[PDB]
């Protein structure tokens, strides 16, 4: 759970050919059925190649984001380098399990790029999903989390297409998110979709249902 139902919210992540995408619902709820905000973003940028989508209790989302920003900033200032996506994923797992017996009520996903050096650099899409105590699912196609997990799983199982350009990836992820949100009472009121490409990030707000 009821604590997740208190606010609602859902995050989704998909991979394409040399691009990734992370989408979220923009609602903030109260008592499971009162909408107080329609611009509560659940996607946070850690660095150029790492994004985290946090869904769950809003206070826990904000707290976890502050902790993660603190840790990432310290790591990056010390190493004089951007934090690796795998390193961030493992650190998030360990942070979540550090509160094993009084956990943060947040179900996160990590979406980004793994950089491989040879001259040029290769960008490999990277997706992970978590449960509230840091159990990690590393995936190559799509990751979901939130109260809309079942709907998102169904939509992504049916509609995900491997190795799509940024345009097809955006269309697929947005369609999945919108169809999954249309069936959830406590999620929706706008959708935000980010498409990551090695050279640019495209941020779009979807014309969604507001009921």
């Amino acid at each position: 759970g009821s604590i997740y139902n208190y606010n609602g919210g859902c995050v989704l992540g998909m991979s394409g050919s040399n691009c990734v995408a992370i989408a979220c619902d923009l609602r903030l709820g109260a008592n499971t059925f009162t909408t107080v905000s329609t611009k509560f973003s659940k996607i946070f940028k850690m660095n150029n190649n790492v994004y985290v989508g946090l869904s769950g209790l809003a206070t826990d989302i904000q707290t976890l984001y502050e902790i993660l920003r603190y840790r990432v900033n310290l790591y990056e200032v010390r190493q004089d380098a951007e934090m690796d996506v795998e390193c961030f994923a493992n650190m998030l797992s360990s942070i979540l399990y550090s509160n094993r017996f009084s956990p943060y009520f947040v179900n996160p996903i990590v979406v980004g790029f793994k950089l491989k050096h040879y001259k040029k650099v290769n960008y490999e899409p990277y997706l992970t999903a978590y449960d509230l105590i840091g159990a990690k699912c590393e995936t190559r196609d799509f990751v979901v989390n939130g109260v809309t997990s079942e709907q998102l799983f169904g939509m992504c199982e049916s509609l995900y297409v491997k190795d799509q350009d940024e345009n097809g990836l955006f269309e697929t992820i947005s369609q999945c998110l919108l169809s999954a949100l249309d069936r959830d009472c406590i999620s929706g009121w706008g959708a935000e979709v980010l498409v990551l490409t090695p050279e640019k990030i495209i941020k779009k707000k979807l014309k969604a249902r507001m009921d």
Binding site: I67, N73, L74, V77, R78
Partner: protein, 243 residues
């Protein structure tokens, strides 16, 4: 009797002075020169590199200028190990402020915290002070571009242009007679090169012994650049043409 071995570091002297702090200041003044100045385009921090050997990895190796945050950076004069300890602490402090307030710490506040650490060391306990002095430059939207100088006692003061380390009197004279309220980044860099050459007692600076960095605020973001050898060499060619 373990007290026979105590040196009583945190104790006043007949003249109302702290011998340990005075000796730490002597060490700082023996250290190599670190200059800083403020232009209308940013804060420039320069330092003289002390030669150890040509087997030292000179690429991607800045040892006298460090980044404390995206909007704060510092130059060091004194003991490198003490400086590293204090720099790690300052980075922790800046990140703690961001964690607490969701905004970046002001440069004055960070300086106050690190100087408070130093003062506490000089007052409490029986441990020696830190043999390091800082030139902390930064930018924030409250006070603009800022440059501060901190000493082992915990004292700090704000400056428009200053120098610490060995032969800082010559650098201070050069900056006093050359620095201007409105300067461009290139002009400030050239002045920094001139003062470094004067302090080092040389005419043509050598890029192998110069550390240069500048912190600017452009397009709504604070950007720090630590000039490489080739960039410093281009600057030195410009300086050679100028003088």
């Amino acid at each position: 009797m373990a007290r026979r071995y105590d040196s009583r570091t945190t104790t006043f002297s007949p003249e109302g002075r702290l011998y340990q702090v005075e000796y730490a200041l002597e060490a700082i003044n023996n250290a190599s020169i670190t200059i800083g100045l403020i232009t209308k385009d940013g804060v420039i921090l320069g330092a003289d590199k002390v030669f150890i050997s040509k087997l030292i990895d000179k690429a991607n190796n800045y040892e006298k200028i460090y980044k404390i945050d995206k909007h704060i950076f510092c130059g060091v004069a004194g003991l490198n190990a003490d400086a590293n300890i204090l720099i790690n602490q300052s980075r922790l402090y800046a990140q703690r402020y961001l964690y607490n307030y969701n905004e970046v710490q002001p440069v004055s506040q960070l300086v106050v915290q690190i100087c408070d650490i130093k003062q506490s060391y000089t007052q409490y306990g029986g441990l020696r002070p830190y043999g390091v002095s800082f030139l902390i430059g930064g930018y924030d939207t409250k006070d603009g571009y800022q440059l501060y100088h901190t000493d082992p006692s915990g004292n700090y003061s704000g400056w428009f242009a200053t120098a610490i380390g060995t032969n800082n009197l010559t650098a201070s004279s050069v900056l006093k007679q050359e620095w201007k309220n409105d300067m461009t980044l290139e002009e400030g860099l050239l002045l920094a090169l001139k003062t470094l050459a004067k302090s080092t007692d040389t005419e043509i600076p050598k890029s192998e012994k110069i550390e240069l960095a500048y912190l600017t605020n452009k397009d709504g973001e604070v950007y720090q650049k630590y000039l490489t050898e080739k960039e410093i060499e281009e600057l030195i060619k410009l300086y050679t043409q100028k003088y």
